């Protein structure tokens, strides 16, 4: 899936060429970025329960109809609340994978491909996930390159959901 390292090799492979200074520079930028990626992943991981239940609560508060309307797609039963917290958990965990990879690869592969189809078939509102994501962004407390990279993936998903 898409990361600086796999993209550089795919380019060289498709040209039948050895790696050159161009791809070496890609590797340099990857390794400049990676420590803050790993640290961002580590922090989000350690703060998972707070972030997921916080995000869940921000969706339910933004859209109170979701906890009070009967339906398979709604969070009006314990089952539905559990489905929703699970889902938010998936978004967050797969964001950490993007930070680990240094690319959208894990997102594209595990979450984004098929997302529209899923949201449509199960009647899940994109705006619910947008809200959960805005909460994670507002509340992860990351700084510097960690922030910047983590927010690029979060906004990547908000963009994909609108």
């Amino acid at each position: 899936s898409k990361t600086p390292l796999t993209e550089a090799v795919a380019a060289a492979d498709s040209q039948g060429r050895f790696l050159s200074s161009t791809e070496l520079q890609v590797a340099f930028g990857r390794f400049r970025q990676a420590a803050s990626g790993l640290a961002a992943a580590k922090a989000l991981a350690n703060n998972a329960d707070s972030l997921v239940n916080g995000a869940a609560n921000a969706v339910y508060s933004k859209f109170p109809y979701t906890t009070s309307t009967p339906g398979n797609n709604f969070a009006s039963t314990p089952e539905g609340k559990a489905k929703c917290a699970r889902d938010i958990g998936y978004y967050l965990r797969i964001v950490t994978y993007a930070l680990v990879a240094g690319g959208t690869g894990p997102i594209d592969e595990y979450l984004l491909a098929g997302l529209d189809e899923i949201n449509k078939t199960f009647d899940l509102a994109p705006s619910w996930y947008v809200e959960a994501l805005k909460y994670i962004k507002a509340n992860h407390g990351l700084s510097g390159d960690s922030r910047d990279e983590a927010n690029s993936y979060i906004d990547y998903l908000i963009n994909a959901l609108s």
């Binding site: 899936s1 990361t3 390292l5 796999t6 550089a8 090799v9 060289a12 492979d13 050895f18 790696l19 050159s20 791809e23 070496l24 590797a27 340099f28 990857r30 390794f31 990676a34 420590a35 790993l38 992943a41 580590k42 991981a45 998972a48 965990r93 797969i94 950490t96 994978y97 680990v100 990879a101 240094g102 690869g105 894990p106 595990y110």
Partner: protein, 172 residues
Amino acid sequence: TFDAFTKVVAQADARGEFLSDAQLDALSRLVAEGNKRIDTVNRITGNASSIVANAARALFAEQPSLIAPGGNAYTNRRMAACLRDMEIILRYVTYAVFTGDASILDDRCLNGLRETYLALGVPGASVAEGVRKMKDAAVAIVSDRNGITQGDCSAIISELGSYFDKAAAAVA
């Protein structure tokens, strides 16, 4: 294909888990050793032609039957195909060093090479030997102390060796 990072990611996603500290720390060390990885790639690449040419020549020297008329490397078309496969394998080995994972080399180069060779009557044992020669040359080039900040490249050299070993075993 995977790189070292997406490989570990795949292992964690299959269990529905965040990377563990052991996993994160292992990737941290890899990152910390990155300049060495880049130097390893650059050095093999910079010497590609002479690694292929010299291993090929030594191969034909030890195995004159390959170049005798009716030999598998006899005629310029077959000699060219042979030199080309040498370069292909070296190329894919450098990709594996670059991504830190064998998958580019296994999935795109080695998989189904044995069967390819069997059908054509390419002698795989001789290919393997050519690869081993390239390995020895590549290792000496990467380990060379001249013109480089000094330090310990034994991990990257060991990883490099392991990819050459995969290439030789895939056809042997």
